[PDB]
Design a protein around this ligand. Sequence first.
Ligand SMILES: [Mg+2]
Ligand SMILES: [Mg+2]
Ligand SMILES: [Mg+2]
Ligand SMILES: [Mg+2]
Ligand SMILES: [Mg+2]
Ligand SMILES: [Mg+2]
Ligand SMILES: [Mg+2]
Ligand SMILES: [Mg+2]
Ligand SMILES: [Mg+2]
Ligand SMILES: [Mg+2]
Ligand SMILES: [Mg+2]
Ligand SMILES: [Mg+2]
Ligand SMILES: [Mg+2]
Ligand SMILES: [Mg+2]
Ligand SMILES: [Mg+2]
Ligand SMILES: [Mg+2]
Ligand SMILES: [Mg+2]
Ligand SMILES: [Mg+2]
Ligand SMILES: [Mg+2]
Ligand SMILES: [Mg+2]
Ligand SMILES: [Mg+2]
Ligand SMILES: [Mg+2]
Ligand SMILES: [Mg+2]
Ligand SMILES: [Mg+2]
Ligand SMILES: [Mg+2]
Ligand SMILES: [Mg+2]
Ligand SMILES: [Mg+2]
Ligand SMILES: [Mg+2]
Ligand SMILES: [Mg+2]
Ligand SMILES: [Mg+2]
Ligand SMILES: [Mg+2]
Ligand SMILES: [Mg+2]
Ligand SMILES: [Mg+2]
Ligand SMILES: [Mg+2]
Ligand SMILES: [Mg+2]
Ligand SMILES: [Mg+2]
Ligand SMILES: [Mg+2]
Ligand SMILES: [Mg+2]
Ligand SMILES: [Mg+2]
Ligand SMILES: [Mg+2]
Ligand SMILES: [Mg+2]
Ligand SMILES: [Mg+2]
Ligand SMILES: [Mg+2]
Ligand SMILES: [Mg+2]
Ligand SMILES: [Mg+2]
Ligand SMILES: [Mg+2]
Ligand SMILES: [Mg+2]
Ligand SMILES: [Mg+2]
Ligand SMILES: [Mg+2]
Ligand SMILES: [Mg+2]
Ligand SMILES: [Mg+2]
Ligand SMILES: [Mg+2]
Ligand SMILES: [Mg+2]
Ligand SMILES: [Mg+2]
Ligand SMILES: [Mg+2]
Ligand SMILES: [Mg+2]
Ligand SMILES: [Mg+2]
Ligand SMILES: [Mg+2]
Ligand SMILES: [Mg+2]
Ligand SMILES: [Mg+2]
Ligand SMILES: [Mg+2]
Ligand SMILES: [Mg+2]
Ligand SMILES: [Mg+2]
Ligand SMILES: [Mg+2]
Ligand SMILES: [Mg+2]
Ligand SMILES: [Mg+2]
Ligand SMILES: [Mg+2]
Ligand SMILES: [Mg+2]
Ligand SMILES: [Mg+2]
Ligand SMILES: [Mg+2]
Ligand SMILES: [Mg+2]
Ligand SMILES: [Mg+2]
Ligand SMILES: [Mg+2]
Ligand SMILES: [Mg+2]
Ligand SMILES: [Mg+2]
Ligand SMILES: [Mg+2]
Ligand SMILES: [Mg+2]
Ligand SMILES: [Mg+2]
Ligand SMILES: [Mg+2]
Ligand SMILES: [Mg+2]
Ligand SMILES: [Mg+2]
Ligand SMILES: [Mg+2]
Ligand SMILES: [Mg+2]
Ligand SMILES: [Mg+2]
Ligand SMILES: [Mg+2]
Ligand SMILES: [Mg+2]
Ligand SMILES: [Mg+2]
Ligand SMILES: [Mg+2]
Ligand SMILES: [Mg+2]
Ligand SMILES: [Mg+2]
Ligand SMILES: [Mg+2]
Ligand SMILES: [Mg+2]
Ligand SMILES: [Mg+2]
Ligand SMILES: [Mg+2]
Ligand SMILES: [Mg+2]
Ligand SMILES: [Mg+2]
Ligand SMILES: [Mg+2]
Ligand SMILES: [Mg+2]
Ligand SMILES: [Mg+2]
Ligand SMILES: [Mg+2]
Ligand SMILES: [Mg+2]
Ligand SMILES: [Mg+2]
Ligand SMILES: [Mg+2]
Ligand SMILES: [Mg+2]
Lengths: 50, 92, 100, 88
Amino acid sequence: EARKLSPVELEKLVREKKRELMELRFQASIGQLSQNHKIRDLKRQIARLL
Amino acid sequence: TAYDVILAPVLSEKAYAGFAEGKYTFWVHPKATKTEIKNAVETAFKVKVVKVNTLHVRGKKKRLGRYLGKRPDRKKAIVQVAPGQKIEALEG
Amino acid sequence: RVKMHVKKGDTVLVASGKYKGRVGKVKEVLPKKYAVIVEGVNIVKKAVRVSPKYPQGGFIEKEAPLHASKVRPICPACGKPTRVRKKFLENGKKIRVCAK
Amino acid sequence: SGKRPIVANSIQRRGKAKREGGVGKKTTGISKRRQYPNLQKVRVRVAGQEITFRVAASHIPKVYELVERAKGLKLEGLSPKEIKKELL
RNA sequence: GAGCCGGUAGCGGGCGUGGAUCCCUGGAUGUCCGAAUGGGGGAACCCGGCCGGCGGGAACGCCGGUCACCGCGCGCGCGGGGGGAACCUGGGGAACUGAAACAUCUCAGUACCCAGAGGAGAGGAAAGAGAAAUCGACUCCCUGAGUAGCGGCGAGCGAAAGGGGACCAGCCUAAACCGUCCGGCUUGUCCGGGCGGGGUCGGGGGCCCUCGGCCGAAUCCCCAGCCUAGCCGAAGCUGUUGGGAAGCAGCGCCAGAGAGGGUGAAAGCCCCGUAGGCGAAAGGUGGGGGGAUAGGUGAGGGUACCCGAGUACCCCGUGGUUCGUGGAGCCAUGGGGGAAUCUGGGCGGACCACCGCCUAAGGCUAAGUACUCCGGGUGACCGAUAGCGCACCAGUA
RNA sequence: CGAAUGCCGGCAUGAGUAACGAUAAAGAGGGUGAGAAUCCCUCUCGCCGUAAGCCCAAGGGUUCCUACGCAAUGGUCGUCAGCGUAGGGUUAGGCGGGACCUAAGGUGAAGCCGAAAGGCGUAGCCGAAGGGCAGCCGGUUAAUAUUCCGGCCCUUCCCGCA
RNA sequence: CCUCUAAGCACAACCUGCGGGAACCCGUACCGCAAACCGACACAGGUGGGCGGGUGCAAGAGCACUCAGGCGCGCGGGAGA
Ligand SMILES: [Mg+2]
Ligand SMILES: [Mg+2]
Ligand SMILES: [Mg+2]
Ligand SMILES: [Mg+2]
Ligand SMILES: [Mg+2]
Ligand SMILES: [Mg+2]
Ligand SMILES: [Mg+2]
Ligand SMILES: [Mg+2]
Ligand SMILES: [Mg+2]
Ligand SMILES: [Mg+2]
Ligand SMILES: [Mg+2]
Ligand SMILES: [Mg+2]
Ligand SMILES: [Mg+2]
Ligand SMILES: [Mg+2]
Ligand SMILES: [Mg+2]
Ligand SMILES: [Mg+2]
Ligand SMILES: [Mg+2]
Ligand SMILES: [Mg+2]
Ligand SMILES: [Mg+2]
Ligand SMILES: [Mg+2]
Ligand SMILES: [Mg+2]
Ligand SMILES: [Mg+2]
Ligand SMILES: [Mg+2]
Ligand SMILES: [Mg+2]
Ligand SMILES: [Mg+2]
Ligand SMILES: [Mg+2]
Ligand SMILES: [Mg+2]
Ligand SMILES: [Mg+2]
Ligand SMILES: [Mg+2]
Ligand SMILES: [Mg+2]
Ligand SMILES: [Mg+2]
Ligand SMILES: [Mg+2]
Ligand SMILES: [Mg+2]
Ligand SMILES: [Mg+2]
Ligand SMILES: [Mg+2]
Ligand SMILES: [Mg+2]
Ligand SMILES: [Mg+2]
Ligand SMILES: [Mg+2]
Ligand SMILES: [Mg+2]
Ligand SMILES: [Mg+2]
Ligand SMILES: [Mg+2]
Ligand SMILES: [Mg+2]
Ligand SMILES: [Mg+2]
Ligand SMILES: [Mg+2]
Ligand SMILES: [Mg+2]
Ligand SMILES: [Mg+2]
Ligand SMILES: [Mg+2]
Ligand SMILES: [Mg+2]
Ligand SMILES: [Mg+2]
Ligand SMILES: [Mg+2]
Ligand SMILES: [Mg+2]
Ligand SMILES: [Mg+2]
Ligand SMILES: [Mg+2]
Ligand SMILES: [Mg+2]
Ligand SMILES: [Mg+2]
Ligand SMILES: [Mg+2]
Ligand SMILES: [Mg+2]
Ligand SMILES: [Mg+2]
Ligand SMILES: [Mg+2]
Ligand SMILES: [Mg+2]
Ligand SMILES: [Mg+2]
Ligand SMILES: [Mg+2]
Ligand SMILES: [Mg+2]
Ligand SMILES: [Mg+2]
Ligand SMILES: [Mg+2]
Ligand SMILES: [Mg+2]
Ligand SMILES: [Mg+2]
Ligand SMILES: [Mg+2]
Ligand SMILES: [Mg+2]
Ligand SMILES: [Mg+2]
Ligand SMILES: [Mg+2]
Ligand SMILES: [Mg+2]
Ligand SMILES: [Mg+2]
Ligand SMILES: [Mg+2]
Ligand SMILES: [Mg+2]
Ligand SMILES: [Mg+2]
Ligand SMILES: [Mg+2]
Ligand SMILES: [Mg+2]
Ligand SMILES: [Mg+2]
Ligand SMILES: [Mg+2]
Ligand SMILES: [Mg+2]
Ligand SMILES: [Mg+2]
Ligand SMILES: [Mg+2]
Ligand SMILES: [Mg+2]
Ligand SMILES: [Mg+2]
Ligand SMILES: [Mg+2]
Ligand SMILES: [Mg+2]
Ligand SMILES: [Mg+2]
Ligand SMILES: [Mg+2]
Ligand SMILES: [Mg+2]
Ligand SMILES: [Mg+2]
Ligand SMILES: [Mg+2]
Ligand SMILES: [Mg+2]
Ligand SMILES: [Mg+2]
Ligand SMILES: [Mg+2]
Ligand SMILES: [Mg+2]
Ligand SMILES: [Mg+2]
Ligand SMILES: [Mg+2]
Ligand SMILES: [Mg+2]
Ligand SMILES: [Mg+2]
Ligand SMILES: [Mg+2]
Ligand SMILES: [Mg+2]
Ligand SMILES: [Mg+2]
Ligand SMILES: [Mg+2]
């Protein structure tokens, strides 16, 4: 769990973004919603040791 | 994999009427798509959901090819009488 | 890949057409259509908009791509094709000889 | 048919004839159809415990040679695999 | 190495000379179906069991493992299963056709089906070939040669030797005997069963006392080189008609680059390139180059020990080879009879006797050759009814 | 290239000719619209009424509904449409299937037989508008409603108490 | 579903009520004797089950009319060979 509880947080954030997108209120789309390239797989990469 | 279930709500004239009784129909992840997403909506909006229904919608389209987007499952919560919260009342 | 070419966003002579010999500024490379825009072809776009905003006053309408095999770069020289000098760690574009 | 210690069956022609035959007079052939000569097969029963083979019956002495043995192992219930793979 | 966020054109939204976009290499995630493989299934879906996880919870849930079947050895483990445009081997295998009918025949062991296998497959080290006191594995190409032949001696089918080439290579195993060991018994100074050691025409081997003795893998790690991204790559300016110059003209220059493309047309000198030469951290690749390993070193003379068994040989039935019953050998083998292990056994085209040749009934064995889904270049190849069926969102409507 | 009842493409002729797909049948007044016999409404007229009306399976799949349209498809026209564009719309412990069962028939461990493909085949499993299983009535939007909601009832399981 | 005992368990396990809990996947729109299915067509054809009202004629799922409901059959206007 050295990298978890962070993607739970960032997937919570992306289900603030996808809420904000459906109503007409998401005015930085690719500036925010394509976080999941570097962010979000920011800490979805470790070698599963042991 | 709990916030990758409830994909999006729907702004619609029918799911603005869900705020009088039973909270709004979301498009849910149409596979891994159980009606026990009650522990995917109350773990997301901190409520106590009584009853959930289920669907399968959204067919075809022209412009050269078919299947307008997806065929996403979408339904709701019949969440307990006034834990209905979580700023949703915007737009309707 | 193949799509890389003469130069980048600097000042550059064009030796093309009506503008056979014109030193334009920073050039704003296209380049999948292999052009730039730089300062030369200034043909009028007889268009309103796609979004109907701030309507038609005059037309001082913008430029055109200008195919990039005719934008001769510049240095303290005129023309003189670019070259590569590496200096053991870099890759710089030095012209037929002046410098830079 | 089968094989159990030998090669499978073959395919023959027939080659009818209607003639006198060379050492008498002029010869001939008639019709070359496919007889399908299924090899000689006999279900043999041996007493390893209850074991059964489809052996070629020009190879019944060979399967009794295979039975005149003691290959160090007891019963799993069926066991012709150790009788047929400890064949030469 | 400066632009990007695919085929973007539009929301404007961001992101980059502290290095992005891309391309390559190596991982990670790979939902579901599919050999499908937990069971079912009407493919892309349902329904589980066990373990481990979230009143998120004991019940329904979802996650992440594991649950097919078969083959090989000691419940335990390593493979197999399906796919592939052709190419190949084996098992099967037509018929129209041709014979100016047709049945033998031909088409043809073709097409096709099935199995198998791999970048090749096959075959392969002589029980060979056949006239030479000869050749010496196998394959492929050209000759032999449309010869020899076969043939309702019609139609037609059609070698092989020799000889040129390519390529090159030989080897493991009971060509018996010694010990080992679960048990066999009539406890036998012994039956067969697994290994192990022996064993491959100082004609072979095992056994019995002289005369003592290391070449080299197909296997293994290496290393170039090859790819899988790329990179550097020479030298032209002016005037002219013109929409536009590279055209025309003048004055040049490079050339290990005057192949080609695009540039507003006709460009060696604008670009991309080409000649030439660099480039691999990572993976494949590879004795082409050197390295070691595994293996190989009754020469002699004897006491007749062993040289692959329902096999050879004989007959009946057939296929293969040029061979269609013929004088029918040979090679395979479905039926029946059924041997011996070197004064053995087979072959040299019935057979027999001389003279030769060669060792079957166990297996492996690179290389050269066929192929082209694939990538590249090449064209007295096509230029949209052509070329693939598709230059285009086509195996689509 | 001139012929192959050639092939592909084009355009003719036939020809403004036959037809326009039921001899159930229309007429009028307002609208709307640029435009109307055809669209909407009204009022008569007619036609089916064991259907030419409702409901469910089969099948088809978004044709449903609303709004913007009318080039194209409607055998005419079309503002209309089922056609084009975009957006909505299909809510189940109780209805139907599956977490249940079998019939014919498949598949099929075992077993048999086939040159290979494979062909059989016991148990088992699959197999359904058959058996079994817990729901009725009303309302609501533009569309769903035995699903949403209102009332009453009922079923399985799991935990706790007796 | 009812029942009987094997294995087993008899500190379980079932059974009856009362309290709480849990109830999953798919189908659901619309046409459905048709302009949306099958017939290349908005095709006079084909299509399974259920309700299919009233009055009259002996009865009737007939026939005649007609509720409810749904259509006037997606070309018409003339003329009167
Ligand atoms: Mg449902
Ligand atoms: Mg549509
Ligand atoms: Mg660098
Ligand atoms: Mg003859
Ligand atoms: Mg024949
Ligand atoms: Mg017997
Ligand atoms: Mg994009
Ligand atoms: Mg980088
Ligand atoms: Mg990057
Ligand atoms: Mg990329
Ligand atoms: Mg994961
Ligand atoms: Mg499966
Ligand atoms: Mg199955
Ligand atoms: Mg399914
Ligand atoms: Mg917890
Ligand atoms: Mg827990
Ligand atoms: Mg599992
Ligand atoms: Mg191994
Ligand atoms: Mg296979
Ligand atoms: Mg024939
Ligand atoms: Mg003939
Ligand atoms: Mg004939
Ligand atoms: Mg032949
Ligand atoms: Mg090979
Ligand atoms: Mg071989
Ligand atoms: Mg030899
Ligand atoms: Mg030859
Ligand atoms: Mg030769
Ligand atoms: Mg030779
Ligand atoms: Mg050699
Ligand atoms: Mg022994
Ligand atoms: Mg040995
Ligand atoms: Mg001696
Ligand atoms: Mg090395
Ligand atoms: Mg090197
Ligand atoms: Mg490269
Ligand atoms: Mg360069
Ligand atoms: Mg250059
Ligand atoms: Mg001119
Ligand atoms: Mg040119
Ligand atoms: Mg031109
Ligand atoms: Mg040129
Ligand atoms: Mg070079
Ligand atoms: Mg390397
Ligand atoms: Mg390395
Ligand atoms: Mg290799
Ligand atoms: Mg021998
Ligand atoms: Mg015998
Ligand atoms: Mg012989
Ligand atoms: Mg003769
Ligand atoms: Mg002798
Ligand atoms: Mg012999
Ligand atoms: Mg010989
Ligand atoms: Mg002989
Ligand atoms: Mg002779
Ligand atoms: Mg080989
Ligand atoms: Mg070769
Ligand atoms: Mg190419
Ligand atoms: Mg041409
Ligand atoms: Mg050309
Ligand atoms: Mg064309
Ligand atoms: Mg074509
Ligand atoms: Mg053309
Ligand atoms: Mg296409
Ligand atoms: Mg013509
Ligand atoms: Mg003619
Ligand atoms: Mg002619
Ligand atoms: Mg024509
Ligand atoms: Mg015409
Ligand atoms: Mg006429
Ligand atoms: Mg007429
Ligand atoms: Mg008419
Ligand atoms: Mg009437
Ligand atoms: Mg009537
Ligand atoms: Mg509608
Ligand atoms: Mg029109
Ligand atoms: Mg029309
Ligand atoms: Mg209008
Ligand atoms: Mg529509
Ligand atoms: Mg209920
Ligand atoms: Mg039910
Ligand atoms: Mg389930
Ligand atoms: Mg079932
Ligand atoms: Mg049965
Ligand atoms: Mg069967
Ligand atoms: Mg089963
Ligand atoms: Mg049923
Ligand atoms: Mg039923
Ligand atoms: Mg409805
Ligand atoms: Mg409904
Ligand atoms: Mg009741
Ligand atoms: Mg519950
Ligand atoms: Mg309904
Ligand atoms: Mg009906
Ligand atoms: Mg209708
Ligand atoms: Mg139809
Ligand atoms: Mg028809
Ligand atoms: Mg009609
Ligand atoms: Mg009809
Ligand atoms: Mg009927
Ligand atoms: Mg009557
Ligand atoms: Mg009637
Ligand atoms: Mg009509
Ligand atoms: Mg009349």
